[PDB]
């Protein structure tokens, strides 16, 4: 009994199947292309990719009732920590052919998997780089609407600010998935999130904060806006 | 003032008005792969020289290592990021590259990434092990031949042996100056010898009890020197490879103990798999048995007294275990967390 | 037809009438030092090409190795000594060089001799000993590195190891063809591999169970190959030196057992002096102890059964003793007598 | 009681000194120059070098009453086996500034000693070469009046003939000092000299033969003429 329907956010689709459960999904921008062994269902001559919240943080955030979702069609996003492109393949679906995605990734063997995908998904520019040194990829990107960060780095906070005060369009959005134990393995999660939010308020206008449980332990997706 | 984009190097004033652009003259990837890291290239220079002859003495790059190389090249320059130049260049791409500007960024972007990323392989760890083995082998031959060089050239200048105990120097001497009768003060200077040593040498040369060598005798010994010199270059190439390949093979391990030490662990273990299968305890004493524990070369360990060492080696082996695992499965970069933790626990040991 | 003198190469017909001379374009010594031994030089060639375009297909040199190199170069030539050319050239020198013709012959003559003769030295035997030691050292490194090359390149083409058991080949392959995907039939041919082996290789290449290498991985291994290749060149240079120096040091010894074996005797003995002080009995077993007697490598000895050997080794050691003495005192060339005698006594042993 | 007087042969001088003995000598072409530690005596403003028959074969031959001596002033001689130039320094004295001497010598360390001498004694051209391969020095010499051979070589005989049929002026002279035991260590000296003379007669007109005793054991200086 597969059935698809629109979702609050443009590009995102809701879908309930056989098991009666409801799931998230997106419109496959490159029909026939699979990125991470995702589940795909044809609605009506069109292909939808089931956005698995267990494989994507952004996914879990949406599933957990995320309020603000800056990533809309035609938007330009600077994705720090693009890795293999699992969750970035969905923002591709969303952002669509008018949207642009500058993906940065430090680990080459990881960034390598995404390269073949961007051939047909010329939506994303896979860039090998280090989010702590934004200059080293200054010639490869342009000011973006949204910055999406998901890096295993203690410096996480400044990274978003550094990259924002260099590539984020003023009055632009920023989404960072923060892992408490990445910043301070000793401190308490709630103690940490309180500081990451403070530090972020010194430059941004923290517009939301959502926990990723039960999908992620001690993780929090923040969304902010550039003054 | 000075910024770059996927097509070339642009120059802007203080008002955001172009001054003089300069498109790359070699493949954009090849050029950017240097300009990005702060290195100066053919095109970047000409663009500067040209701005000079146009009443410009002030320059500001978006990368420090660049401006640093710039000033020591003659151009007084500062460093600001993002500078007015790049801000303009990144705000209105179409204004400089066209309507299909993003498709260009995409082209070079991808090209540059394929350049920088090695292609997939099932044995690159094995390949790193051979390079490390080669490095050791090369060190063994350098010594064997340098000894031969000292013993042979000393038939003609026995005194030089002890005055140039540093092999690279002794090798450069034989290769550069050749016959002991070419010893000036400017050549001994051009080799970078302390003005004091230049004295002990020039002096030992006049009292030299060594045998006479003619042109034929000297040339053969220079051939030997040249070869030791080419062997010193090979060594650098092996190091350079180890460093690059370790990025594909075990980036986490490289970030923790450096590419060479990491490569060494993998070699002692027999492969990255094997390394990932070991427990902290085994990594702690890996490669040694008087020799003990190769991970003891870790700067934090070495600079400490034997009684403060073991504790640290433990903390390290525990981090190496995690790094070896993630490097063997995904390659995901997590060493920064790993490093923070290890650095904090080492401060406790003190 | 074609002869040479201290100024250049001349050409005469069948009547002793000059056709076309050609003065040397590099120092006369440098040129003659080759034309004399039968080697062809820049000027000799042009003189020929010029005679060709003048209705001449027949040439006759005064030296065989010359005419031999000539024909295989395209010019059908014979060899006659003294040919009409030289007979004229040597009968009337003034007719071609002037009134002070002898002073020219004297000039070049002396120059050529100073070129060919090494300057005096008190330790050239010592210098020959180091070259021999270097040769051994170089062989040791070639093997150590060639092993490394086989082990490393076999990660990408394990099959090639056994198909090219001859190191120089294996080295040339890696260096020349590089990545296993550059294996054509013309490149494997250009390496001089038997058409049959080219098959076993091309075949093993399609079934190759080896790992993938990218450009970076391959380049580092080629660097290693290049270096082994430069080491093979150094080796030749050491041999070439040993050969030349032995002419000053021990010409008699060189004529009897060859420059390398002679050099070896001197090294085992510790100097030419030491060698001269030994008796036949000690030379007979010099350098060996399963290894025995280095002089047993003597072609006449080796090609004989163990029971016919000792007798010969004796005759040789006795001649080597005489040669070592005269080489150490005067250097006077007497090996021809020494050889005749030894050759006659060896025929008796049979 | 030193006293010098002329000798049968031009360039050669007889001299009797204190010990009452009589000796051979020549006129030092390069005054003040000593070649082999020879004895020199000033006659009258002029220098004479005592030609020691114990150090020179040609010397012993003259002292033993050699009859024919082709080496006269102004003559050109091709000396095979010039070695250090001891005996060749005397033929220099004789042959004088109009005479020419092409000296061939196989052993470089030996030929080297002569080089400094020929600087001022520009009478002789020291040539490093092998008398068995005359071609390899064809460009360095010209047809000569006399050929003087003194080589330790079994092939001795042909060597003189090879070099003669290439550089000896027709009706020209040739002098070879033959060492019996160099040709055949077994055969008898007289048996050997008989064959070396036969072999030499096939091309030359053997004009003389003189034994070098008591100066040399089993040695014979032959002189011949080119047909």
UniProtKB/Swiss-Prot annotation, chains A, D:
Keywords: Methyltransferase, RNA-binding, rRNA processing, Transferase, tRNA processing. GO terms for biological process: box C/D sno(s)RNA 3'-end processing; tRNA processing. The keyword Ribonucleoprotein does not apply. It is an enzyme of class 2 (transferase). InterPro entries: Fibrillarin (IPR000692), Fibrillarin_CS (IPR020813), SAM-dependent_MTases_sf (IPR029063). S-adenosyl-L-methionine binds at residues 86-87, 105-106, 130-131, 150-153. It holds the Pfam family Fibrillarin. Interacts with nop5. Component of box C/D small ribonucleoprotein (sRNP) particles that contain rpl7ae, FlpA and nop5, plus a guide RNA. These sRNP particles form homodimers, giving rise to an asymmetric holoenzyme. This is Fibrillarin-like rRNA/tRNA 2'-O-methyltransferase. Its EC number is 2.1.1.-. Involved in pre-rRNA and tRNA processing. Utilizes the methyl donor S-adenosyl-L-methionine to catalyze the site-specific 2'-hydroxyl methylation of ribose moieties in rRNA and tRNA. Site specificity is provided by a guide RNA that base pairs with the substrate. Methylation occurs at a characteristic distance from the sequence involved in base pairing with the guide RNA. Disulfide bonds: none annotated. Belongs to the methyltransferase superfamily. Fibrillarin family. GO terms for molecular function: histone H2AQ104 methyltransferase activity; RNA binding; rRNA methyltransferase activity.
């Amino acid at each position: 009994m597969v059935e698809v329907k629109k979702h609050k956010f443009p590009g995102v689709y809701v879908v309930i199947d056989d098991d009666g459960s409801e799931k998230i999904a997106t419109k496959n921008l490159v029909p026939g292309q699979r990125v991470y062994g995702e589940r795909v269902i044809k609605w009506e001559g069109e292909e939808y990719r089931i956005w698995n919240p267990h494989r994507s943080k952004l996914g879990a955030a949406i599933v957990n009732g995320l309020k603000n979702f800056p990533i809309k069609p035609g938007k330009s996003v600077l994705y720090l920590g693009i890795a293999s492109g699992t969750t970035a393949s969905h923002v591709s679906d969303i952002v669509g052919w008018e949207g642009k995605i500058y993906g940065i990734e430090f680990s080459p063997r990881v960034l390598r998997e995404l390269v073949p995908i961007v051939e047909e998904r010329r939506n994303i520019i896979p860039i090998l780089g280090d989010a702590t040194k934004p200059e080293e990829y200054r010639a490869l990107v342009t000011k973006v609407d949204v910055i999406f960060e998901d890096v295993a780095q203690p410096t996480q906070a400044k990274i978003l600010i550094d990259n924002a005060k260099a590539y984020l369009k003023r009055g632009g959005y920023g989404m960072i998935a923060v892992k408490s134990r990445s910043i301070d393995v000793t401190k308490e999660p709630e103690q940490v999130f309180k500081e990451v939010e403070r530090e972020l308020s010194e430059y941004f206008e923290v517009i939301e904060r959502l926990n990723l449980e039960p999908y992620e332990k001690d993780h929090a997706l923040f969304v902010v806006r550039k003054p | 003032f000075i910024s770059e984009n996927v097509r070339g190097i642009y120059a802007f004033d203080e008002n955001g008005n172009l001054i003089e652009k300069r498109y790359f003259t070699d493949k954009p990837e090849k050029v950017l792969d240097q300009l990005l890291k702060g290195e100066i290239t053919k095109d970047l220079e000409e663009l500067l020289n040209s701005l000079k002859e146009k009443g410009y003495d002030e320059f500001v790059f978006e990368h420090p290592e660049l401006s640093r190389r710039a000033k020591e090249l003659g151009f007084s320059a500062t460093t600001e990021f993002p500078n007015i130049a790049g801000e303009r260049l990144r705000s209105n791409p179409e204004e400089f590259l066209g309507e299909n500007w993003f498709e260009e960024y995409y082209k070079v972007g991808v090209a540059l990434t394929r350049m920088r990323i090695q292609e997939q392989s099932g044995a690159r760890d094995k390949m790193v092990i051979q390079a490390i083995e080669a490095l050791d082998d090369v060190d063994k031959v350098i010594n064997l031949l340098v000894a031969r060089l000292r013993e042979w050239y000393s038939l003609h200048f026995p005194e030089l042996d002890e005055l140039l105990p540093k092999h690279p120097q002794y090798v450069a001497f034989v290769k550069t100056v050749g016959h002991r009768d070419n010893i000036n003060e400017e050549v001994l200077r051009e080799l970078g010898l302390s003005e004091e040593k230049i004295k002990k040498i020039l002096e030992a040369k006049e009292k030299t009890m060594g045998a006479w060598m003619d042109q034929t005798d000297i040339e053969v010994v220079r051939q030997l020197a040249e070869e030791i010199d080419r062997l010193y270059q090979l060594r650098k190439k092996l190091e350079d490879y180890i460093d690059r390949a370790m990025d594909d093979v075990a980036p986490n391990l490289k970030a923790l103990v450096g590419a060479k030490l990491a490569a060494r662990l993998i070699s002692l273990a027999g492969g990255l798999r094997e390394l990932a299968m070991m427990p902290s305890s085994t990594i702690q004493v890996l490669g040694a048995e008087p020799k003990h524990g190769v991970i003891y070369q870790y700067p934090a360990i070495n600079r400490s007294p034997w009684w403060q060492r073991g504790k640290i080696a433990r903390a390290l082996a525990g981090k190496l275990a995690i790094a070896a695992r993630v490097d063997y499965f995904s390659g995901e970069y997590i060493a920064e967390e790993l490093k923070k933790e290890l650095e904090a626990r080492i401060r406790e040991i003190k």
